[PDB]
Design a protein around this ligand. Structure first.
Ligand code: CA
Ligand code: MG
Ligand code: MG
Ligand code: MG
Ligand code: MG
Ligand code: MG
Ligand code: MG
Ligand code: MG
Ligand code: MG
Ligand code: MG
Ligand code: MG
Ligand code: MG
Ligand code: MG
Ligand code: MG
Ligand code: MG
Lengths: 97, 127, 245, 100, 116, 82
RNA sequence: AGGGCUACACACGUGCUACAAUGGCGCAUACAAAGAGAAGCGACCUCGCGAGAGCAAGCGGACCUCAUAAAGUGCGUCGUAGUCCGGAUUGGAGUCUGCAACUCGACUCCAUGAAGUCGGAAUCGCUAGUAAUCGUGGAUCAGAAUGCCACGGUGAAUACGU
């Protein structure tokens, strides 16, 4: 089983990882290493004056962070627990068999 | 017992392995004279060897990914000068005096708002 | 059981699909899409009609869903996974045997594996198909898959089925398919047919027949067809592909 | 934006996604080379009949706060102005000033 | 080196030379010198009367020179006599295909007419 | 121009009211805002006064006017010179 | 609903493409970065000279798709011509988006082949991976960049001095 973790904060994500790679160890299973992935950086430019003045801008950004964790030898026990976990708000997870 | 460097210039990265031998070179499963058309490139790649006359006393092996020609060519030179002063912690001082040991750093400047390029700014004629 | 519609049931027509297995297998080669173990076999037969298989059966686009800004093209392409509604879990064609098991009685699930060759094992075309169109509506799996087979055999038996059996390996024409088909059902319900050909020269790969919604359970007849103005890309002639390459 | 102008966008959305299928299939025959000249010719007359405001190309993305027709951003559904205003409060998760 | 009742350069590669014919561009030039299986790099001066004729033949397949010039002129007369928007653009001597005139448009209008 | 496969475009309203012109022979001019519509052969012989923005202007249709679009005969700007 | 903001004796500003041989054309062949995609990015196959069309894998993506970088390089040709330079203008024939491209779209093929031979007085940018020059992406967006915002390739000149 693979779970991909994704979020806007980096401290926040490096929690959920540690949380999951604690349970996986708990409910007897081998977890194949939290491996980080390229972080997408959507960028935006906007006129900051409400009229005229083209050369006056802000440059905004959203950094998305991706993490991947595997499940080597999925115990029957684990599959329920790693499914049943209330996980920090503002974090998307995608467990997929 | 093969000696290794990484080497970077602009956007290039060059991982290199040297071994004692008669003076062969491979870049990305290819020969020097093939991979690099431009003459400059060649000069640059071998000038660390040409310095410490091991031009034909060691046999080199390389791969490069990223950058253009003068980038890769440059990145390789740095790669060698790293390995070549690791096989021999001795040579450093000589290598260094030629200014091969430093990693260039010069990158392309970003484009900025209000400008046509990094620093070129649109005309306005007082004419 | 009878095939009836629970949640959602407001559509004009089922649309039965049929893969000319030889012609289907052929494309796979031409395009170089991987050798699936279904075609890897492709052993010959005595009757040259058992190549006419069921690829699927597909309910119409139910008015309710259509009223939320959904059109046939999307409907077909996603089915129950369509948004905003119905929006059920996604039936991947790339990871087939990951979709839920259907619950199929081996009475049907043998009958099916005679007319849907790559069903079960490491193929699960059954599973995927149920997700894509069955699930949403709330059908009886043993009935639904059942109702397919019923209709498949009916067509092999008809004048239509015979024509392919006859002109196997040979080039043909729509006209002589048109006759063939009509002689069973009528010169009223020809347009309900739509063909699909591939390659050069054209060889038939797929056949689709657009059956009225009320008449799905009760056997076929001159009043069990809904003609639609799309005849398909096949053109004036086409090969009835023989097995091989 | 004038209340009226905000409104038209609702009239226009509603129709667009009610006749959505009718248009699609009624278009589908038009572009079918291999179809009845009788059919397709009918269609051309039939599409032009059902109402203009029911076309998706007829609508205009307006900030869903102030109604502005210009300087829209899809990611937020807001004008450049309201995007900035909200950005600075921290009402847009993640978003923040950038340098490189 | 007389084709379509005009003199063709005889020191030019056939490809280039044949273009002097009004109504043949470069695509046609290539075709001609293959439909009439004549090489491209061959200069016109080093040919046979025979070669020049089979060539003369190919060119007759098209509508060219005089003929063409007439066709065009009919088409434009046709428009102006119809009086369509496109017609008047041709009369008043203005960009016929939607181009701006507030500025530029000097190829139709010709060089500048000052004020006063 | 419009793809060839999609056929020639005419607004229906106007298409209809040049059956009654051609069947039930009249001899009046017709009002129309249908500058889109291309001129069909049926339209040969009938004056039809197409809108230019403020006024309708008569276009006595002919053989030569076939395929073109009405509005291609109702100029919409006034210019004498400077 | 239709038209107008796209009007054109003219004046000014900001750009693009040129005027050629450090170049045009044909064949052959190297080396990037950054970014976008959900009912969206759309391969492979078939059709078409081409814009494209049909069919339909994969991908909510370090995996699939956009999407083959170009200048460069080798071999050939043109031989200093208003030219094999330039590509404006216009006729003919198409494609696609869209209820709909007459006024007023982008693109394609065939033909056409203008001004321009390096620009008076004035006047602007830039001190290093900068200027110069070459390609790539994105936002807006049904369709409609030579603009804007980003990304790499090649890569100078000269500062005595006040
Ligand atoms: Ca075969
Ligand atoms: Mg991405
Ligand atoms: Mg500016
Ligand atoms: Mg640059
Ligand atoms: Mg108000
Ligand atoms: Mg719009
Ligand atoms: Mg041309
Ligand atoms: Mg209006
Ligand atoms: Mg304006
Ligand atoms: Mg320039
Ligand atoms: Mg040229
Ligand atoms: Mg885009
Ligand atoms: Mg082709
Ligand atoms: Mg400075
Ligand atoms: Mg550029």
């Amino acid at each position: 089983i693979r779970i991909r973790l994704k979020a806007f904060d980096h401290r926040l994500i490096d929690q959920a990882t540690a949380e999951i790679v604690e349970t996986a160890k708990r409910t007897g299973a081998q977890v194949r290493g939290p491996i980080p992935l390229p972080t997408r950086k959507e960028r935006f430019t906007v006129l900051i004056s409400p009229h005229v003045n083209k050369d006056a801008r802000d440059q905004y950004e959203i950094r998305t962070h991706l993490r991947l964790v595997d499940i080597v030898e999925p115990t029957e026990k684990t599959v329920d627990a790693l499914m049943r976990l209330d996980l920090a708000a503002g974090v998307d997870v995608q467990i997929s068999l | 017992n093969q000696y290794y460097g990484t080497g970077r210039r602009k956007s290039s990265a060059a991982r290199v392995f040297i071994k004692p031998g008669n003076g062969k070179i491979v870049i990305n499963q290819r020969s020097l004279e093939q991979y690099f058309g431009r003459e400059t490139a060649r000069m640059v790649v071998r000038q660390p060897l040409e310095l410490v006359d091991m031009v034909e006393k060691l046999d080199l092996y390389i791969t490069v990914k990223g950058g253009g020609i003068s980038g890769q060519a440059g990145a390789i030179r740095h790669g060698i000068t790293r390995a070549l002063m690791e096989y021999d912690e001795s040579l450093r001082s000589e290598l260094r005096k030629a200014g091969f040991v430093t990693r260039d750093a010069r990158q392309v400047e970003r484009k900025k708002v209000g400008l046509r390029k990094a620093r070129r700014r649109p005309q306005f004629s007082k004419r | 059981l009878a095939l009836q519609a629970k949640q959602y049931g407001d559509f004009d027509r089922y649309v039965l699909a049929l893969s000319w297995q030889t012609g289907f297998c052929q494309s796979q080669h031409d395009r170089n899409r991987n050798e699936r173990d279904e075609c890897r076999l492709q052993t010959e037969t005595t009757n040259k009609a058992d190549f006419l298989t069921v690829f699927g059966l597909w309910p119409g686009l139910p008015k309710s869903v259509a009223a939320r800004g959904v059109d046939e093209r999307r409907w077909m392409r996603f089915g129950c996974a369509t948004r905003p509604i119905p929006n059920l879990p996604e039936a991947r064609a790339s990871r087939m045997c990951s979709s839920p098991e259907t619950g199929l009685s081996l009475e049907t699930a043998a009958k099916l594996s005679e007319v849907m060759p790559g069903a079960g094992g490491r193929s699960c075309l059954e599973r995927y198909e149920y997700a894509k169109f069955g699930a949403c509506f709330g059908f009886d799996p043993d009935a639904y898959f059942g109702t397919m087979v019923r209709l498949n055999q009916e067509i092999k038996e008809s004048e239509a089925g015979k024509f392919l059996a006859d002109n196997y390996g040979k080039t043909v024409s729509r006209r002589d398919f048109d006759a063939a088909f009509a002689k069973s059902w009528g010169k009223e319900n020809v347009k309900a047919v739509k063909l699909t050909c591939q390659g050069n020269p054209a060889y038939l790969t797929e056949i689709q027949i657009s059956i009225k919604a009320d008449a799905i359970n009760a056997p076929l007849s001159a009043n069990s067809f809904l003609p639609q103005p799309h005849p398909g890309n096949c053109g004036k002639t086409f090969v009835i592909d023989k097995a091989g390459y | 934006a004038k209340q009226s102008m905000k409104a038209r966008e609702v009239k226009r959305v509603a129709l667009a996604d009610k006749y959505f299928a009718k248009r699609a299939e009624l278009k589908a025959i038009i572009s079918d080379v291999n179809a009845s000249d009788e059919d397709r010719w009918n269609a051309v007359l039939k599409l032009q009949t059902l109402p203009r405001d029911s076309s998706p190309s007829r609508q205009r993305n307006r900030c869903r706060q102030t109604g502005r027709p210009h300087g829209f951003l899809r990611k937020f559904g807001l004008s450049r102005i309201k995007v900035r205003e909200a950005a600075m409060r921290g009402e847009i998760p993640g978003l923040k000033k950038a340098s490189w | 080196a007389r084709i379509a009742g005009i003199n063709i350069p005889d020191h030019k590669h056939a490809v280039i030379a044949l273009t002097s014919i009004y109504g043949v561009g470069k695509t046609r030039s290539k075709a001609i010198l293959a439909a009439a299986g004549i090489a491209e790099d061959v200069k016109i001066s080093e040919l046979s009367e025979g070669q020049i004729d089979t060539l003369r033949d190919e060119v007759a397949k098209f509508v060219v020179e005089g003929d063409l010039r007439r066709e065009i002129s009919m088409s434009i007369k046709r428009l102006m006599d119809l009086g369509c928007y496109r017609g008047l653009r041709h009369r008043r001597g203005l960009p016929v295909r939607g181009q701006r005139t507030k500025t530029n448009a000097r190829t139709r209008k010709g060089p500048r007419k000052p004020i006063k | 121009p419009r793809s060839l496969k999609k056929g020639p475009f005419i607004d229906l309203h106007l298409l209809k009211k040049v059956e009654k012109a051609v069947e039930s022979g009249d001899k009046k001019p017709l009002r129309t805002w249908s500058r889109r519509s291309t001129i069909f052969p049926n339209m040969i012989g009938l004056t039809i006064a197409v809108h230019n923005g403020r006024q309708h202007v008569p276009v006595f249709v002919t053989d030569e006017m076939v395929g073109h679009k009405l509005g291609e005969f109702a100029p919409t700007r006034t210019y004498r010179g400077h």
